């Protein structure tokens, strides 16, 4: 399909990889005894390996000639769960972190001892700001509009 | 580092090993310390390159953590 890849559900090398891993795990399982915790752990390993391979097969995942899932990150929504949705999730979380950090910096920057409140965090104010970051996309595009997001010329510059 | 390298190679090459039932001594490396530890190329090849085989081929085995720590320590 895309880039010459093929779905992993029809990739023979993918099933060969699964079979080889299961065979190695079973051979390891053979050298232990009865329902002893080592055998239980190896059986859990086998079950998890089978579940992971089955989930990857039924996941709209494209496999190359090596039988490994390749990620299609050109931007198409068909393979949108590989990069685009995790990209949105990370952008949300990281914007949350950056927004709460910036808000805390600007909030304790207007107190008597701004530097003290950076090594000794005001946990009440920190908790107040941190749970308010869920609106960071909206807060950012409400502070940029008011001109409160960017400094203009009070920023320092070197000699040249 | 040089001291521990000397210890490791000398022990593996001229002390450690197995003894046959008839009394024949076979070492881990095979006595290569006497003739190949006298050149820097010998140290590079018959010790570093040769005994680093287990670290680089540890992936997928129970010693894979040693390969990961090898790479991380290089980093």
């Amino acid at each position: 399909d895309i880039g010459g890849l093929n779905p992993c559900k029809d990739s023979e090398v993918f099933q060969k990889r699964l079979a080889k891993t299961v065979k190695k795990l079973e051979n390891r399982l053979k050298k232990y005894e009865e329902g002893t915790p080592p055998q239980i752990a190896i059986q859990q390993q086998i079950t998890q390996t089978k579940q992971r391979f089955t989930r990857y097969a039924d996941s709209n995942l494209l496999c190359g000639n090596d039988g490994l899932p390749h990620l299609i990150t050109d931007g198409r929504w068909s393979h949108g769960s590989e990069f685009l949705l995790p990209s949105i999730l990370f952008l949300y979380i990281s914007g949350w972190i950056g927004w709460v950090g910036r808000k805390y910096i600007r909030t304790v920057g207007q107190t008597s001892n701004p530097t003290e409140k950076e090594i000794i965090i005001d946990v009440p104010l920190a908790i107040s700001i941190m749970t308010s970051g869920f609106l960071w996309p909206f807060a950012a595009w409400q502070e940029f509009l008011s001109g409160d997001l960017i400094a203009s010329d009070e920023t320092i510059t070197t000699s040249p | 580092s040089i001291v521990i390298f000397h210890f490791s190679w000398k022990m593996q090459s001229d002390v450690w090993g197995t003894v046959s039932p008839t009394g024949a001594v076979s070492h881990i490396t095979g006595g290569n310390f006497a003739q190949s530890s006298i050149t820097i190329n010998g140290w590079l090849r018959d010790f570093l390159w040769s005994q680093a085989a287990q670290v680089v081929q540890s992936y997928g085995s129970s010693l894979s953590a040693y390969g990961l720590i090898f790479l991380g320590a290089h980093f």
Binding site: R52, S81, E82, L85, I120 | -
Partner: protein, 41 residues
Amino acid sequence: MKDFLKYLSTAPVLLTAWLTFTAGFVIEINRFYPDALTFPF
């Protein structure tokens, strides 16, 4: 317990607690839903 709570509010203790909590919920997500290569949806 007025200065002890202030000590717990210091940067190292707070960072250690936050990173321990963060690693904790990451590890537990990866335990309950392991081997997640793509988005579940």
